[PDB]
Amino acid sequence: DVKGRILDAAADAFMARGFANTTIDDIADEVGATKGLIYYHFRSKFDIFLAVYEDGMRRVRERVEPHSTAPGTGHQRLEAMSIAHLENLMTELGYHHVVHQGVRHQDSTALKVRQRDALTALNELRRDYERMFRRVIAEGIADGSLRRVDEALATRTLLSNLNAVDVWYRKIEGQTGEEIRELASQVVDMLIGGLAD
Amino acid sequence: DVKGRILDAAADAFMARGFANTTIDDIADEVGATKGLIYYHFRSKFDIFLAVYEDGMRRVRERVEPHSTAPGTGHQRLEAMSIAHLENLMTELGYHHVVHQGVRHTALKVRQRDALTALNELRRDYERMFRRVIAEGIADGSLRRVDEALATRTLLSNLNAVDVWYRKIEGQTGEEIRELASQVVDMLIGGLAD
Amino acid sequence: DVKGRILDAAADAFMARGFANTTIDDIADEVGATKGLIYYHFRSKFDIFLAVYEDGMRRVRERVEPHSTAPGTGHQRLEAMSIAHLENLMTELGYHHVVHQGVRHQDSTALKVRQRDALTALNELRRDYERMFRRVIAEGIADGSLRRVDEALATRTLLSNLNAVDVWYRKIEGQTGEEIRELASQVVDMLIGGLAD
Amino acid sequence: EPDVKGRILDAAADAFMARGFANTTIDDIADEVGATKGLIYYHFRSKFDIFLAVYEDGMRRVRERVEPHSTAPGTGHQRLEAMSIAHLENLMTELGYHHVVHQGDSTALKVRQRDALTALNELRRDYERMFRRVIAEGIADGSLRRVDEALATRTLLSNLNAVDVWYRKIEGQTGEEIRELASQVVDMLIGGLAD
DNA sequence: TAGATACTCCGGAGTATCT
DNA sequence: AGATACTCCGGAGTATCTA
């Protein structure tokens, strides 16, 4: 809808300059409207952050979730989903770096009630996403395919691993689904397989 | 002394809230004086950032550059390197969080854009050595033969983002830290499924 | 049109007090609105200094350019050009001051990359305009009219010296065009002619 | 041996020329001389003091090293041509000091110090008085042409001053070579273009 | 859309006290 | 005799609101 036009606009500017440096008129001329359309559709500057958070975080789930019931060993099964995770990062890059930031801004802001409720739901529904990988690494060492390492560290770092890719990856904007998934092929196995022999 | 007291109080403060929402007097009550002595030593709020970015990295290349010519193979030196790298990240995570966060990002003096750039590609010198020991780690290969250009930029990036989940387990000795950095690099260098 | 009125007041204010003593509120007062109007049309304080500086370069070029492409010798072109150059100083005295103190403190003061570059993106328009006065002083130094003297310093001197009229010039409000043209012709004979014969 | 206050004013004057009067701060003047703010404020009562201390010395430099060419023998042109030379040399050795002279009350100022700026601006017109005479002593003398001696004074010293637009520095040449660089310019301003 | 209003936070001059 | 530190304050900029 029209809201997504601002959501698409704010996302890229949110990576380039963060939250506070991103001013409301810094994203007003970018989409091509005065400050009213931002305030007609979004009651506050924090609301834009949450709506982008509430969209992109479902974007990730809706694109990885069906890879959890498909059959395979926990290395074969999880590699299948986590390839599609780097896929989602690279296609809708705007909605994927916003999920790194967050609680940093809740501290600095004197929060309204509605954002504090919406933030909380997103606060654990990311944790529930962590449960998926916390769930489907278990089958990795339950079907005997992964290094028998700590059940928490393997989860915490690998999601920390997968998301840190947006430090160097800028864009291609023309990268077909082949080069997207085939760049996603060598980066998951780089982390999954490691560097050892 | 007095300056070093401010740099610490500024470093963790920049980590805790971010350069944008860390007011000058917000970092002045941690040291116990008024903004007067915070601005007396550093002419700008951006100059403090450059005084942390230049010590935080100077304190990380004093552990991991020593492990460039040492008793080890490709992995046995790279593991020794990445332990002492992720070591200081674990001890002074305040001084760490500025560098890789403060990359994508404003008004800037002539002596500041270059001074930030002359420090933002000194971080490329840190990256230069890690690609140098992955090539050394492939000729005398104890590690896999994947492409250099991207695998060099991943593991270092993978190992700077340890802080997103990493707490501060209070009471750590020198022994706790190096072992705490042990299983994470073996998580990361050795990887999984091996 | 209001943006021009902001530039008109800004050029008046910027000339009289400078850049520093010119506060955002001052331009708002001389236009007749609050601080918000000034920021509704411009991203920053400096982003209007380019607007005054960029517009002022058009004004002279729109009215001084034909006199370089006109019949006559090197003397007959400078006089037709230099008079019209002073006809701009003596009419829009505000705009013409902005193109003096724009290069000096550029290093010593902060600017965004899209602003400091936009500064020197217009600072060629000074040199690309001084090119016209190097192109026609040229066609006199060897082609008859102008005294044989180095092409470079004669362009440094003349331009810096018919631009130094703002030191003493004071616009008598209620001015007429034929009065200003007469005063311009007076000074030029002082400048191109000299004092010898 | 060295002079503390002189090192402050020489460093401050060039600071005023580059950044401006506002863009240079008090600690900015503490860096070029390599000192602390308290040294500035134990010697100078305020930052406006700095500006009247270089203005007072800019004149004593400008007014003194150019006066002996209004009394030197020669016509009104012979005086003026050599008079403008020692003025250009002066600007080109005292870039900060001379640029202050044409860098002049829109706010309430301290009376004791205000009463010196307006006076200092009266040694100002006192300087262009000599330019007023030698031009008038030359226009109908014959060495110069017929010109509005008011205009010929306004537009000439403002022109001889207009050099600091492009002249940065050399600091490799000396009096003999700086004589050449000023010579071509006064020959421009005095001689003209068309012949 | 067009501005007005509130308000913060950065930086600088000036002053007070200590070195 | 300067240094160090503090205090006061201006004003640029940005968020929210109101016509």
Author numbering:
A (entry chain F), C (entry chain T): 10 to 206
B (entry chain A): 10 to 114, 118 to 206
D (entry chain G): 8 to 111, 116 to 206
Give sentences copied directly from the paper behind this entry.
The mycobacterial repressor, DarR, a TetR family regulator (TFR), was the first transcription regulator shown to bind c-di-AMP. Recently, DarR, a 201 residue, TFR regulator of a putative MDR transporter, Ms5347, in Mycobacteria was discovered and represents the focus of this work. Structures of TFR proteins reveal that they share a two-domain architecture with an N-terminal DNA-binding domain and a C-terminal inducer binding/dimerization domain. The DarR N-terminal domain consists of helices 1-3 and the dimer domain is comprised of helices α4-α9. In DarR, dimerization is mediated by helices α8 and α9, which interact with α8´ and α9´ (where the prime indicates the other subunit in the dimer) to form a four-helix bundle dimerization module.
However, to deduce the molecular mechanism of operator recognition by DarR, we next determined the structures of the Rhodococcus sp. USK13 and M. baixiangningiae DarR proteins in complex with a 20 bp site containing a double stranded (ds) DarR DNA operator, 5´-TAGATACTCCGGAGTATCTA-3´ (annealed to its complement). The structure of the Rhodococcus sp. USK13 DarR-DNA complex was solved first by selenomethionine SAD and refined to 2.96 Å resolution. This structure was then used to determine the 3.49 Å resolution structure of the M. baixiangningiae DarR-DNA complex. The Rhodococcus sp. USK13 DarR-DNA complex showed a pair of interacting DarR dimers in complex with the DNA (herein referred to as dimer-of-dimers) in the ASU while the M. baixiangningiae DarR-DNA structure contains two such complexes. These DarR-DNA complexes show the identical DNA binding mode, whereby the dimer-of-dimers partially encase the DNA using an electropositive surface. The same protein-DNA contacts are observed in the Rhodococcus sp. USK13 and M. baixiangningiae DarR-DNA structures. The distance between DarR recognition helices was found to be 39 Å for both DNA bound Rhodococcus sp. USK13 and M. baixiangningiae DarR dimers. By contrast, our DarR-DNA structures reveal that the centrally bound subunits of each of DarR dimer makes critical inter-subunit contacts. These β-sheet like interactions are formed between residues 116-125 of each subunit. Notably, these residues are adjacent to residues that interact with the inducer ligand in the M. baixiangningiae DarR structure and hence would be subject to allosterism.
